[PDB]
């Protein structure tokens, strides 16, 4: 009824969570990439 102004932070927090998951994934990916001589 009045708590409607709460879902927008709920969306952005999970967006940032999956975003940082992708970030650490690509971090590990580039760490593997730089293992080059």
């Amino acid at each position: 009824k009045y708590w409607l102004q709460f879902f927008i932070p709920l969306l952005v927090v999970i967006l940032f969570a999956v975003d940082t998951g992708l970030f650490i994934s690509t971090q590990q990916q580039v760490t593997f990439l730089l293992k080059i001589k």
């Binding site: 009045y2 409607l4 879902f7 969306l11």
Partner: protein, 160 residues
Amino acid sequence: TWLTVLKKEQEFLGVTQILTAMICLCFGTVVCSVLDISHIEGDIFSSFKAGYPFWGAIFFSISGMLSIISERRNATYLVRGSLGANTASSIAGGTGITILIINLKKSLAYIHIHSCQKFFETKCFMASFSTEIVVMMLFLTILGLGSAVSLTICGAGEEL
């Protein structure tokens, strides 16, 4: 030189397409779940009443998935299907943009006059909430449609 650079970057537009498709479902679900649409006194819900996110999410998801798989897998019949899905998504977006424009047109008039003085949380907070949601929807739909038209024009790049 535009053709080559657009050919190199194909599936990232598919990534933003699938992100759009996944995100547009949430607004529809929450709007249809928290409160019913058939008894809105202000009649603000017009785009949501027609189920536009339901119309567009499937088309955008198909377009993005097909674009991603085309780069991932070079199937013979998938190339034409990707172009067809891109065109279908382009037409769907072209209709939805007009739908949201008329929705904002019919929504601003109520709020402007005599309904809610200044900002919300006086008598008409839910309409301001819906207005913010639909403005975000319109902006994100423009962002998706730009990538959609770019992918559509890039995909053909050849006679038939």
